[PDB]
Design an enzyme around this catalytic site. Sequence first.
Site, short mmCIF file in Angstrom:
data_model
loop_
_atom_site.label_atom_id
_atom_site.label_comp_id
_atom_site.label_asym_id
_atom_site.label_seq_id
_atom_site.Cartn_x
_atom_site.Cartn_y
_atom_site.Cartn_z
CB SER A 133 -0.89 0.04 1.18
OG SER A 133 -1.74 0.98 1.14
CE1 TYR A 146 -3.42 0.12 4.55
CE2 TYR A 146 -4.60 -2.17 5.35
CZ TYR A 146 -4.16 -1.15 4.66
OH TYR A 146 -4.18 -1.62 3.08
CB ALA A 148 2.76 -1.26 11.75
CE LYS A 150 -2.00 -4.25 3.48
NZ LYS A 150 -2.32 -4.89 2.01
#
Lengths: 230, 227
Positions: A133, A146, A148, A150
């Site tokens: 992402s 989130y 972290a 990814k």
Amino acid sequence: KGTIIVSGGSQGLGLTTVRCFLEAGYNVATFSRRESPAVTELSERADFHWQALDCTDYSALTAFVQQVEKRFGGLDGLVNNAATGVEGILSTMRVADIDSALDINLKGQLYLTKLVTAKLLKRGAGSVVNVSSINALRGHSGLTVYSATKAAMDGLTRSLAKELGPRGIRVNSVSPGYFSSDQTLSRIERRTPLGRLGTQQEVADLILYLVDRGTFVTGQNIAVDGGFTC
Amino acid sequence: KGTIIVSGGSQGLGLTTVRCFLEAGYNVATFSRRESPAVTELSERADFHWQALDCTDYSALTAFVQQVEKRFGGLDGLVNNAAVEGILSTMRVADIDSALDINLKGQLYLTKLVTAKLLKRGAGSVVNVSSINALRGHSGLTVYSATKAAMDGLTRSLAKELGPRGIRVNSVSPGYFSSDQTLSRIERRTPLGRLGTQQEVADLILYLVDRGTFVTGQNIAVDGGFT
């Protein structure tokens, strides 16, 4: 060609990615918590297979991987796609939501990767793509946990590429930006050089390239975000 | 004046980082799983607190952060330090779990607690101590690299989030440094051709907390040019 497992392929980008491996010549297996009209695809669109599964469970993933290997005789690659979102500042953040977020978004992926990687080592060739992402590259308020999870997979990509390289397996990350899935829209379009949302088919295309023709490419994290990040 | 919490700081880099903060004029609170001497510092060099603690137990970190906040008035910075070779195909499912729990959730827990204290004061500095493995890629360091690179994604993010409240957040990525074979493939692969010292890493950490006032969102390698 061969076989690809795509995690979380029952809808959205996973589904577009499934429907793109299939047109390209690959057998595809996928899984999700619940069945959607993957029911259609179950009839066979390059022979495809789908199963209920909980990704946090190791013995379930073991059965699934095994089944996928009995059904198609082989594994050629993996697309780590399955992720659950986590909006919200870290101060409002419920301690239990952090735990689910690590288990769904990081642990499952690492479990699957360990499983499929084992099969890939038998064959002596394969490719893995971790779908990540732009939040893993830039940083956006309220996507703390989130980001972290990814960025973790992007850390796994570089290290696992050094590890599986000598055994002929490639590993890469794809970092999608903003694409349509089912009016600050304006801020986004203005910050994107290409001045519009991406299409799932454009992200899936990138993934496809890195599985099917990315022969000397490994350890990379490519953004497909209309220039948003650059 | 100025209080810093440092994670796992009873030995190695943690402990060097701790002394560096005491010597610089800060109140330093720290913990670990077990004591070791350097209970010498119980008397206080610049006012010190240490305590045994399981970094994955949220009640325990709460008591620690509440208590320390009481002992020093409030909190100015956090240093996330606390810290595993092996190829993925050999690793047991259990080591995947504890590594994720120790190296990652612990850190998030502590970050969540301390950050709330930092919002109170309107200013402050967080520093996540990562590793050049989160940047480059080393075989047999898969899960470690994942957990390190997790705490760099966090940095960038939390920088954007806490920034408009005057807290800056940064990663330091150490390379190879002396820590209590005949690899000199590492000296040949390091432009400066010599392992780093703990003092050098701690020095960059000090700079980021004590004075890098318009620097945030960064990840800086102290690796002798290795990456």
